[PDB]
Design a protein around this nucleic acid. Structure first.
Ligand code: MG
Ligand code: MG
Lengths: 220, 222, 101, 67, 97, 390, 51, 59
RNA sequence: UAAAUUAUGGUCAAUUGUUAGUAUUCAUAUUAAUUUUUUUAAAUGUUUUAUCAUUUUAUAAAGGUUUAUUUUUGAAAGAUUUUUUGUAUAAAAUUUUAGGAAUAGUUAAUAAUAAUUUAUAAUUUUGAUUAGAUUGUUUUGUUAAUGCUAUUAGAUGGGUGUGGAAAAAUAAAAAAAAUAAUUAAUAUAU
């Protein structure tokens, strides 16, 4: 029940330095940007008091709101933030878009991942995690052939491949039976020396049983 | 066993006193030739004409300047070709007087006596663009200043020591350095006032105000 | 100043000092006339006030709201017998009038 | 500490201009800077570890508990 | 010199005061020797862009390598063999002749 | 504390006073317990530890040695505090138990950092990755193990720290019984160090802890021990050790170069040890703290040729295969590379047979100090030189 | 004259007693004895109605 | 504004004596020297006083 | 006496008036006049007491002349404690003379309060003593000025050994042992 930083040598010089008339503005900015806050319901309420008190909020305030919505999987809250950032023309960073992409991917909202991916596809340099939420959205609807096109879209954009990208793309080659697609994926993991996940190991053992491609090429 | 006390800079530097009965005789040339006799060509390697430092820790921290120095054990001493010029009161006074009398005669090099506060003032004048270069700068006795000229006349117009009589020295406060930076109601980066700090670093009047220090004032030049 | 005065050295130029007086007169004594940095704190009270020990005020938009200076006729002395002025000691005495104006 | 006794005997504190009247005059005004518009997310990030570098302790100093 | 560096109080004019020194000499070197300060990625890239794509590129510097690099723990006991050898060398004679 | 009549101890009285019988003594547990007792002290516990009735030079050397022990123990205290902070930070960010952090993997680190980055916490992922990166180099329980053992052996060597580890009032954790413990874990740990580590004085002097006499006598005892296990038939008369196989295995202790180097003298070449191994000749020199004397301490090429010619005259070895090489050692300590070069050049031992003969050589992690650059330049120009053939 | 004159931010962001430097005020040993005896006499005053 | 030491000394004089200093102390007075003795017959053996001698230790 | 190393593969300047502070008029400023103003004529009531007495009431001026200064343990403050006990008597330091030479109730030691002794004593040409001028004092004035020029806080070995302290022959307050009066302005002439 106290502001965590009170004053007298903790606030920057250009703001005057502990103007006590704005002591509530200094305490409100630390609650908005608290990295240890995990209550998403308070984060939406803390935006409404910074809107009322006239507190200027940059992209770091909205990224802290979108971060807290991913463990409770608040897909409705992540879209109302991006509606407001588009309403005020505050462009979200790639970490903030990746939070709303992950909040909608874990809620099985595949139609809403694809429309928020297409909003920031050409303009923003999206991440492999931002491509991963589109992979998990395609695989949730049985689009395992279409989920491999996201991996080709990630390769065309110059975004490198991470071990969580190989984990879900090798699972997409199971239902699609795309053994020629997983031939390029398995050769790329050995050249890049990535650790193979337990879900990626069983995906390679199933396709090497059906197509017999690892035994005739001597790659294990 | 009682040992004799070494008294003076000549006995503490270990002077041979080869000339009979004279203690104030110059020794650098004979000692340089004996040190050149000391070195030998080792065959299964000799030294170069670049300057040398007696310790490996005495190398300059700049990697480009370290290419111009090498490590000689006892051959790093007695370096140089020019000797101490004669015919005043202070080495700063003589350093200002020789440059002032040689810039009027339109000469290329001025042989000035090398002290600690002289070569630092020369380095500050070379940084500000008043001096084109130097010759034999590692010599601890005297070095040559290569002057700068542009379209007939000299770059250095007025060069005056702080001890104008040659005797009375002055200690500048940082208030004096801020006065010298803002003199006659303008901002003065034109006239260069040089001082020596308590850390024996030769610093102009701009960098003295930059870190809020003063020093003993040496000379002005513009 | 000697007895009952905090001045330790002359303002601008001094005879040559040695030892701790040389380091004190040029670097380490107090100086409130420095417009960039206040006189320093001891260790370790200078590291945490690094961002505050620069400049005077960060504004540089100071709209002057006081009375305007008088250019003709210029009054040399401003001496008033006052009744409720508690700064009347500081408001008298010869002061140097040098500013932006 | 300021105090003002009213003519009816009431002891009240001083107003802001009444408190500033006892100092030297400050005759400027800032018509631009508004402190709720300060940036706080990118570069201006005051950390609690920077305030923990002073190492304020109650066992090593008991002035706070005494007050 | 430029004339505005002689009369005006702007701070990069302090760059005009000193002599010309090399940019590889003033900046700290790398693992191979002297290096330009614009050739290291962490200097030329601003800090607000070092969050999304930067670690996505540089994931391979930390989490890629051989099986002995990725599957071997490095926080184990590194002096158990010396301890066992000194214990068995103290135990086995058990006498001073 | 220091009493009237306390004396500093050598290795013999440390061996005799702390001679107790123990069975299966835990090195790491007693080490952590004694260091936990050390870290719970204040600075005022380090004040009155110098014995009073001693001359001023001996008191100054004892004060320097105790200050070195205090600063190395403070450095290990802040390192252990950083270690516990990093382990607690990893166990708090991940959610894994604390005791299984040290047995974790890099694939597990990649999975946990990818899980933290998937939830949108790049700051916590960077903190976890940096804590694990600075935990892989420092997080072993035996990290500075030989240095900590030599610190506790030095605390026993002072003689005034033995009563500072007992007579404490503690509480039982489960029953809350206030009692006074008389158990001294420092005495048990020093007894186990003396019993198991028979060459703890050699490691103590080689790490630079001995400020009184240096490491030269420990170097001579180390070379005599390594000669007795390679020649296996050794006679030792005073300062001369000889093998009687007919093949030349001779160690000659010439002089101590600290007192032999007269400051202000012109005499080129003063060595400490002379080792003749077969046809090879090694002039083992410990460098001085004077940088103006290191250039005078190494002998000339003509002097080395004269020494090799004297070896040809005395030993009757023909001058066709006679090689003489200088060897320079650091002044106040002996790093790992110097001992490796001493085993390679002088005794002709590789790494595996030196680890078989010497068990504590693998965990010896002393390196050259960075602030002595002229010694490293001189040792690079000396140790990379070819054998001088007569 | 000086109608608008501001001071540094360091003056109003500083803590208490952080400007005092450590000064070694030496004195005579007779003054040491006198001040120690005076402080020991002032400490040992009996608690009456005046103390 | 930063007041000098003379402001503090004036404050001390005001708190001591009630006022700082009475004005009109200079007065530009013509101090004339009137000699009485003969030319080289001053009644002293070393220092012969023939002008207005200033009085003051440190001023 | 190293001998002109060849994608010239990136040019597009500067100025948006925001300042790290002794700044110089050989003729102008300070002094008296063209102008000063306003008064003042002494001869005087401090008070309580136990009554021809006792208790409280410690820096007026001229003169003479000083290199320097401060703090009573004692009286009061002041207390349900008490010995006239609560460290006051000291040091460094800086004056001037248009015609520059000697000085002394003298220096140190001391079983010596209150010096019958000892000594090759002490000050001074790095300026003494005497004679002259003489309170001192970053408080004044002037200037671009570490320059020149001014000063009025004070003290007082034979008046009385009283008093804690001589400062005692005269001061619009410093209200002086019962709330004399304490609203305000003249507060003095009256
Ligand atoms: Mg009394
Ligand atoms: Mg006598």
């Amino acid at each position: 029940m106290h502001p965590r930083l009170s004053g007298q040598g903790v606030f920057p010089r250009y703001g005057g330095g502990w103007m006590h008339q704005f002591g509530h503005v200094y305490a409100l900015q630390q609650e908005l940007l608290n990295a240890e806050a995990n209550n998403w319901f308070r984060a939406m309420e803390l935006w409404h008091t910074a809107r009322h008190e006239g507190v200027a909020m940059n992209v770091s305030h909205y990224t802290n709101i979108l971060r807290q919505c991913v463990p409770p999987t608040a897909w409705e809250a992540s879209l109302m933030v991006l509606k407001q950032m588009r309403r005020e023309n505050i462009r979200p960073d790639v970490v903030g878009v990746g939070c709303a992409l992950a909040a909608c991917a874990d809620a099985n909202r595949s139609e809403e991942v694809e429309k928020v991916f297409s909003c920031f596809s050409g303009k923003l340099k999206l991440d492999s995690i931002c491509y991963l939420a589109l992979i998990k959205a395609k695989m949730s609807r049985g689009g395992y052939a279409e989920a491999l096109a996201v991996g080709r879209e990630q390769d065309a954009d110059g975004v490198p491949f991470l071990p969580h990208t190989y984990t879900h793309l090798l699972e997409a080659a199971e239902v699609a039976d795309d053994g020629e697609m997983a031939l390029e994926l398995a050769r790329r993991m050995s050249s890049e020396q990535w650790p193979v996940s337990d879900r990626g190991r069983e995906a390679l053992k199933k396709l090497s049983t059906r197509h017999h491609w690892e035994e005739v090429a001597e790659y294990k | 066993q009682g040992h004799r006390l070494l008294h003076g800079k000549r006995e503490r530097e270990g002077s041979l006193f080869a000339v009979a009965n004279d203690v104030k005789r110059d020794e650098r040339l004979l000692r340089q030739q004996l040190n050149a006799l000391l070195e030998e060509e080792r065959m299964p390697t000799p030294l170069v004409d670049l300057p040398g430092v007696e310790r490996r820790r005495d190398l300059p921290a700049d990697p480009i300047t370290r290419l111009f120095f090498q490590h000689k054990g006892d051959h790093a001493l007695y370096y140089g070709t020019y000797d101490k010029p004669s015919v005043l009161y202070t080495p700063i006074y003589d350093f200002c007087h020789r440059i002032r009398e040689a810039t009027e005669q339109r000469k290329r090099f001025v042989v000035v006596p090398s002290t600690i506060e002289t070569r630092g003032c020369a380095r500050v004048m070379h940084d500000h663009g008043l001096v084109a270069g130097f010759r034999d700068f590692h010599n601890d006795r005297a070095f040559a200043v290569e002057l700068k000229y542009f379209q007939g006349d000299s770059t250095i117009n007025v060069i005056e020591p702080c001890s104008y009589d040659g005797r009375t020295e002055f200690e500048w406060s940082p208030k004096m350095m801020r006065r010298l930076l803002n003199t006659h109601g303008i901002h003065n980066r034109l006239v260069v006032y040089i001082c020596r700090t308590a850390d024996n670093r030769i610093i102009d009047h701009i960098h003295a105000v930059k870190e809020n220090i003063g020093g003993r004032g040496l000379m002005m030049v513009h | 100043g000697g007895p009952g005065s905090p001045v330790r050295g002359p303002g601008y130029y001094a005879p040559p000092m040695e030892g701790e007086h040389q380091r004190g007169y040029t670097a380490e004594w107090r100086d409130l006339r420095n417009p960039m940095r206040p006189p320093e704190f001891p260790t370790p009270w200078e590291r945490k006030y690094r961002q505050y020990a620069r400049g005077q005020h960060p504004s540089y938009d100071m709209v002057y709201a006081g009375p305007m200076p008088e250019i003709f006729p210029m009054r040399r002395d401003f001496r008033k017998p006052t009744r409720w002025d508690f700064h009347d000691i500081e408001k008298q005495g010869k002061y140097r009038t040098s500013g932006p104006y | 500490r300021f105090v003002i006794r009213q003519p009816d005997g009431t002891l009240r504190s001083a107003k802001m201009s009444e408190m500033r009247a006892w100092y030297w005059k400050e005759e400027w005004a800032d018509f631009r800077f508004w402190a709720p518009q300060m940036e706080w997310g990118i570069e201006n990030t005051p950390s609690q570890e920077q305030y923990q570098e002073h190492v304020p302790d109650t066992t090593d100093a008991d002035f706070r508990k005494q007050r | 010199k430029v004339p505005h560096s002689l009369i005006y109080n702007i701070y990069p004019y302090l760059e005009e005061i000193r002599r010309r020194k090399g940019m590889m000499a003033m900046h700290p070197p790398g693992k191979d020797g002297l290096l330009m300060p614009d050739r290291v990625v962490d200097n030329r890239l601003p800090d607000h862009l070092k969050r999304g794509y930067y670690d996505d590129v540089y994931w391979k510097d930390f989490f890629a390598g051989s099986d002995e690099h990725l599957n071997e723990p490095r926080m184990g006991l590194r002096g158990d063999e010396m301890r066992r050898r000194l214990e068995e060398a103290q135990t086995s004679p058990a006498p001073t002749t | 504390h220091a009493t009237y009549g306390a004396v500093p101890l050598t290795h013999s009285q440390v061996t005799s006073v702390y001679a107790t019988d123990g069975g299966k003594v835990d090195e790491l547990g007693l080490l952590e317990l004694v260091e936990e007792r050390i870290f719970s002290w204040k600075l005022n516990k380090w004040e009155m530890r110098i014995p009073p009735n001693l001359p001023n030079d001996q008191k100054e050397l004892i004060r320097q040695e105790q200050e070195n022990l205090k600063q190395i123990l403070s450095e290990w205290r802040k390192c252990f505090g950083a270690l516990n902070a990093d382990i607690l930070q990893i166990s708090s960010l991940t959610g894994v138990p604390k005791d299984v952090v040290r047995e974790k993997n890099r694939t597990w680190l990649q999975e946990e950092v990818a899980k933290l980055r998937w939830m949108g916490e790049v700051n916590k992922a960077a903190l976890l990755r940096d804590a694990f990166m600075r935990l892989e180099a420092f997080g072993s329980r035996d990290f500075m193990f030989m240095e900590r053992l030599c610190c506790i052996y030095g605390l026993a060597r002072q003689g005034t720290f033995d009563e500072a580890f007992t007579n404490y009032i503690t509480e039982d954790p489960v029953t809350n019984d206030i009692f006074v413990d008389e158990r001294n874990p420092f005495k048990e740990l020093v007894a186990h160090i003396v019993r198991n580590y028979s060459q703890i004085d050699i490691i103590y002097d080689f790490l630079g802890f001995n400020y009184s006499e240096g490491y030269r006598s420990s170097l001579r005892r180390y070379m005599e021990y390594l000669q007795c296990k390679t020649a296996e038939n050794v006679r030792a008369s005073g300062r001369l050790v000889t093998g009687d196989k007919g093949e030349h295995n001779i160690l000659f202790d010439y002089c101590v170069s600290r007192e032999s180097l007269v400051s202000g003298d012109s005499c080129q070449g003063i060595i400490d040890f002379l080792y003749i191994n077969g046809n090879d000749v090694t002039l083992i020199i410990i460098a001085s703290d004077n940088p103006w004397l290191r250039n005078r301490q190494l002998p000339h090429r003509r002097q080395m040729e004269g020494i090799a010619r004297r070896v040809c005259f005395v030993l009757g070895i023909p001058p066709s295969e006679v090689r003489i090489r200088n060897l320079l050692l650091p002044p106040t300590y002996l790093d790992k590379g110097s001992i490796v070069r001493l085993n390679d050049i002088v005794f002709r031992l590789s790494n595996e047979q030196s680890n078989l003969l010497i068990p504590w050589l693998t965990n010896y992690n002393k390196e050259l100090d960075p602030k002595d650059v002229d010694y490293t330049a001189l040792a690079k120009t000396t140790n990379e030189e070819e054998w001088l053939t007569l | 004259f000086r109608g608008a004159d501001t001071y540094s931010v360091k003056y109003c962001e500083q803590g208490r007693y952080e400007y005092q430097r450590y000064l070694m005020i030496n004195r005579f040993p007779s003054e040491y004895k006198k001040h120690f005896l005076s402080f020991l006499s002032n400490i040992r005053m009996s608690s009456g109605s005046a103390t | 504004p930063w007041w000098n030491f003379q402001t503090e000394h004036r404050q001390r004089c005001v708190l001591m004596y009630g006022g700082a200093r009475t004005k009109n102390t200079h007065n530009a007075n013509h101090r004339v020297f009137i000699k009485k003795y003969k030319r080289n017959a001053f009644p002293n053996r070393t220092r012969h006083h023939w002008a207005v001698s200033m009085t003051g230790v440190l001023s």
